[PDB]
Design a protein around this ligand. Structure first.
Ligand SMILES: Nc1ncnc2c1ncn2[C@@H]1O[C@H](COP(=O)(O)OP(=O)(O)O)[C@@H](O)[C@H]1O
Ligand code: VO4
Ligand SMILES: [Mg+2]
Length: 762
């Protein structure tokens, strides 16, 4: 206690500066800085030593005098207040969302300054991680992945774009497709991003973007993989959220000529938009450029939505310019808009119960126009559309549908059409930068981040499961495999105990008894029930740590068979299971599929082709496991994005919110491991072998281990900076620049170091 300031708990800041006045047996007595007398108690566990200079920060948290969760937090906070959003933990990068545009840190000049630079020789930056992946790709001859993680709104998508800009601008061609990988983005975001209450630009699908390289290590092309577009959003949103951006970009920015041809109007006029928020993102100027006939009553009364990045009218323009830069012609552009508008009109079709015997329903007379616009835009016969929406084929006979069923059919058609449109968009983007062969790639992974709301459904379940898989890859690669390597090599590093989540994964995906398999079972039963599925889950996993029955409120609560709590690595989430069975089924009824494949329009037909049950859950599992196989085969780098607060505002560091993210991400565990661990390593026989042919007949040439030691000394290392295992030599944090020199294989460099080594062994 003698006699310095310490860190101790604080409910909103995470930690606070205090002094140890009295020392009890199980607890200490703390006086908060500048409050003498208004003390409080804290368990000895909960109190940590502080850095002596509180206004100074370090670039790598491994450089702190005391490595702990409170000093890590403070160091991040101080850098944040100076608008420095990036900090290292050894070779892992931490990125806190600034929520404003920090001048010049992403400029061309900044890009240039990071090229070829070793980690630790420039300030922490996403560009440095990207450059590191490129350098390792060449030197190790090994494909690379950059994994960007974080909860919704933390900055994964922005940082993914920074990485892609850096690599194509630095190692591209300066010709055409260098820009194309970058310029594709606004196109994918227009179709796949939407306003949620957590992020005005939320990604509603995951992606892995690969940049492929030739053997001379120049960019030859790209490939974008995409995962599970959120479907429900297409037809209904909550009052503060929107549908995908493209719908508002079109309504706001389309020319009068296009608006008329697509028969568009203000967003309040469409069921598929009008339960959600119908306001545009716009500012004082861009609002002048949006015509009055585009503005809903909500918009005229409350004004525009504000975001420092999004602008519906401006983004429509940028999106069209992007389409042209990547080689989409005006014809293809209008084809896309036609399908979008065609989906809008489809949602405006309503039904009414029919008078006849064994009757279903008819289109309401006031729906006649929507039916007309819809059929024209999709190349369909009105009568065919009418029959496909109001009847069902089933043995040969046609069955009338009730109004609800017709509602469901209308929406199923809309979801499949929009979803196939999205697939078409991704594939068209891939055709923008194709390639025939490549040597290696650098891939950047950007998933939909961890999220939860008042009510969570199948959509959140799939998203959070994807996040759980990603954290497990992080756990496996960084915390598990690392410590096992230290042990197999004989290093004697103190085991670091960490929170593993394989059990959460097993709960979801295990054969027969995993949640996904039990759900599939229910789809295949004679009379499928959300309640039966939910009971079976609880039954099969009574007392599992990661599953729980909802708790019941006395202030509406959720019954045993109406939901469950999953304890995800990022916190517990309560899912309502209604509609889990229906949402788990991806098959489209024959009558609807056939309607579409017979469109007059080639473009429409080609979206589909050049009890049927299909599992959404299991298809997604299969895709993620293929992704996982690919990541395992690469060198992986990690960027942990952090959301500073819940209001999307700059300069509001919420200490406790941020601490919790540092804790569940495993970054606190990594910092602990780096106290005694080694982020770099190389086989010493391999080092020796690479130098051998430049070595004269001297002591150095006879003994590989002694040669490596002399090499290390000649590049400035001492005994404390490295350690020999059984087959590899390991290097401490802070020595990345020296490690790169050790690994370098340029013949002139080797010959030079040989000359120095022989002086060290004379
Ligand atoms: N480095 C950054 N610079 C400026 N703005 C940022 C940065 N990172 C995030 N943002 C802002 O945060 C919002 C949410 O970030 P995004 O990357 O969309 O989150 P997610 O992690 O869900 O992908 C962005 O639309 C942008 O306004
Ligand atoms: O708000 V995010 O792009 O993690 O879905
Ligand atoms: Mg995103």
């Amino acid at each position: 206690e003698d006699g310095k300031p310490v860190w101790a708990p604080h409910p909103t800041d995470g930690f606070q500066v205090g002094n140890i006045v009295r020392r009890g047996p199980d607890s200490l007595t703390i006086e908060p800085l500048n409050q003498k007398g208004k003390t409080f108690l804290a368990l000895i566990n909960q109190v940590f030593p502080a850095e002596e200079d509180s206004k100074k920060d370090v670039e790598d948290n491994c450089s702190l005098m005391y490595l702990n969760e409170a000093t890590l937090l403070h160091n991040i906070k101080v850098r944040y207040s100076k608008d420095r959003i990036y900090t290292y933990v050894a070779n892992i990068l931490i990125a806190v969302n600034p929520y404003f545009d920090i001048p010049k840190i992403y400029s061309s000049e900044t890009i240039k300054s990071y090229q070829g630079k070793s980690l630790g020789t420039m300030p922490p930056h996403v560009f440095a991680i990207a450059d590191k992946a490129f350098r390792d790709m060449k030197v190790l001859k090994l494909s690379q992945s950059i994994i960007v993680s974080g909860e919704s709104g933390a900055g994964k998508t922005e940082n993914t774009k920074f990485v892609l800009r850096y690599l194509t601008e630095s190692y591209g061609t300066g010709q055409d497709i260098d820009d194309r990988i970058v310029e594709a983005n606004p196109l994918l975001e227009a179709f796949g991003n939407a306003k949620t209450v957590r992020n005005n630009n939320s990604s509603r699908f995951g992606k892995f973007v690969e940049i492929h390289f030739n053997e001379k290590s120049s960019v030859v092309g790209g490939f974008v993989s995409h995962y599970l577009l959120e479907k429900s959003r297409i037809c209904v949103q909550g009052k503060e959220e929107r549908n995908y951006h493209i719908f508002y970009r079109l309504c706001a920015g389309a020319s009068e000529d296009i608006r008329e041809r697509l028969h568009l109007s203000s967003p309040d006029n469409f069921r598929y938009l009008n339960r959600g928020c119908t306001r545009y993102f716009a500012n004082k100027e861009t609002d002048k450029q949006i015509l009055q006939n585009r503005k809903s009553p909500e918009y005229l009364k409350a004004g525009s939505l504000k975001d420092p990045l999004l602008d519906d009218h401006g983004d429509f323009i940028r999106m069209c310019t992007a389409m042209k830069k990547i080689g989409l012609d005006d014809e293809e552009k209008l084809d896309l808009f036609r399908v979008v508008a065609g989906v809008l009109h489809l949602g405006n079709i309503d039904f009414e119960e029919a008078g006849s015997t064994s009757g279903g329903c008819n289109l309401k007379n006031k729906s006649t126009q929507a039916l007309e616009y819809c059929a024209e835009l999709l190349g369909l016969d009105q009568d065919d559309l009418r029959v496909s929406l109001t009847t069902r084929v089933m043995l040969v006979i046609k069955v009338p549908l009730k109004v609800e069923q017709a509602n469901n059919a209308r929406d199923a058609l809309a979801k499949t059409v929009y979803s196939h449109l999205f697939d078409h968009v991704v594939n068209r983007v891939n055709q923008c930068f194709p390639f025939e062969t490549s040597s290696y790639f650098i891939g950047v992974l950007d998933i939909a981040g961890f999220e939860y709301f008042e009510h969570n459904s199948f959509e959140q379940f799939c998203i959070n499961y994807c996040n759980e898989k990603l954290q497990q890859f992080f756990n496996e690669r960084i915390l598990k495999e690392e410590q096992e390597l230290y042990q197999k090599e004989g290093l004697g590093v103190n085991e670091v105990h960490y929170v593993d989540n394989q059990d959460c994964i097993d709960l979801i995906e295990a054969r027969l008894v995993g949640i996904l398999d039990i759900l599939d079972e229910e789809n295949r039963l004679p009379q499928p029930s959300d309640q039966h599925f939910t009971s079976a889950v609880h039954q099969k996993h009574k007392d599992h740590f990661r599953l729980s029955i909802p708790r019941k409120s006395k202030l509406e609560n959720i019954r045993d068979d109406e939901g469950f709590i999953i304890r995800h690595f990022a916190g517990a989430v309560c899912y309502e299971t209604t509609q889990f069975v229906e949402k788990n089924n991806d098959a489209l009824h024959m009558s609807l599929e056939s309607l579409i494949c017979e469109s007059r329009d080639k473009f429409i037909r080609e979206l589909f082709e050049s009890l049927s049950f299909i599992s959404v859950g299991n298809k997604f599992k299969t895709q993620l496991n293929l992704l996982l196989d690919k990541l395992r085969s690469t060198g992986a780098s990690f960027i942990r994005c952090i959301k500073p607060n819940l209001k999307m505002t700059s300069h509001h560091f919420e200490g406790a919110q941020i601490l919790s993210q540092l804790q569940c991400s495993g970054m606190v565990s990594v910092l602990d491991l780096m106290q005694g661990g080694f982020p770099s390593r190389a086989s010493f026989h391999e080092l020796y072998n690479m130098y051998k042919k430049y070595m004269p007949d001297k002591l150095a040439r006879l003994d590989p281990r002694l040669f490596c030691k002399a090499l290390f000394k000649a590049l400035g290392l001492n005994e404390i900076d490295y350690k020999f295992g059984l087959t590899k030599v390991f290097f401490r944090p802070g020595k990345f620049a020296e490690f790169d020199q050790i690994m370098k294989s340029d013949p002139d460099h080797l010959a030079e170091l040989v000359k120095r080594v022989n002086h060290w062994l004379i």
